[PDB]
Design a binder for this molecule. Structure first.
Ligand code: HEM
Length: 146
């Protein structure tokens, strides 16, 4: 897990992002796809389609919303190793079955801090908290077998 201090920093940088969950969640998904084109191919609904096609999709909102809803829960429980345990297991389990592995999460991690900063400057120490959080997710995926 993260420490309470770290978790707070993550929550603090997340708030402005989560404040506009619909628009920001769609944006994160679009940015991912733009920076890491292979990612879309894991999605049944988006495989083959271009970013414009994805933006125009009536399915986009369903996807991006479930993602932000779960990220919000990770931010919320981050400092509790116990909840993280279960959360990480279950998340990894789920993703692996779809063929997603740690490398895709290494990509999310790379682009995350820059995405948050495009919404509002994060507090000092927040970027490191996110990379640690994503670090925990990456580890989970590896244990999950990918
Ligand atoms: C940024 C962190 C992300 C979060 C919080 C997140 C969250 C989730 C959630 C909550 C589910 C639905 C689980 C279910 O209903 O059983 C899901 C499904 C899935 N996610 Fe993620 N995800 C993350 C990033 C990714 C990445 C990077 C990819 C691929 C590169 C991905 C690929 C998938 C796929 C392929 C599904 C199956 C759902 C479908 O398309 O029908 N996720 N994800």
């Amino acid at each position: 897990s993260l420490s309470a201090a770290e978790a707070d920093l993550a929550g603090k940088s997340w708030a402005p992002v989560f404040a506009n969950k619909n628009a920001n969640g769609l944006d994160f998904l679009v940015a991912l796809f733009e920076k890491f084109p292979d990612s879309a191919n894991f999605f049944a609904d988006f495989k083959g389609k271009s970013v414009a096609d994805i933006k125009a999709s009536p399915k986009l909102r369903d996807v991006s919303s479930r993602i932000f809803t779960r990220l919000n829960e990770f931010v919320n429980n981050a400092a509790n190793a116990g909840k993280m345990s279960a959360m990480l297991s279950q998340f990894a389990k789920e993703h692996v079955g779809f063929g997603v592995g740690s490398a895709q999460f290494e990509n999310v991690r790379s682009m995350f801090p820059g995405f948050v900063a495009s919404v509002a400057a994060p507090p000092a120490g927040a970027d490191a908290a996110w990379t640690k959080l994503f670090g925990l997710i990456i580890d989970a995926l590896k244990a999950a077998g990918a």
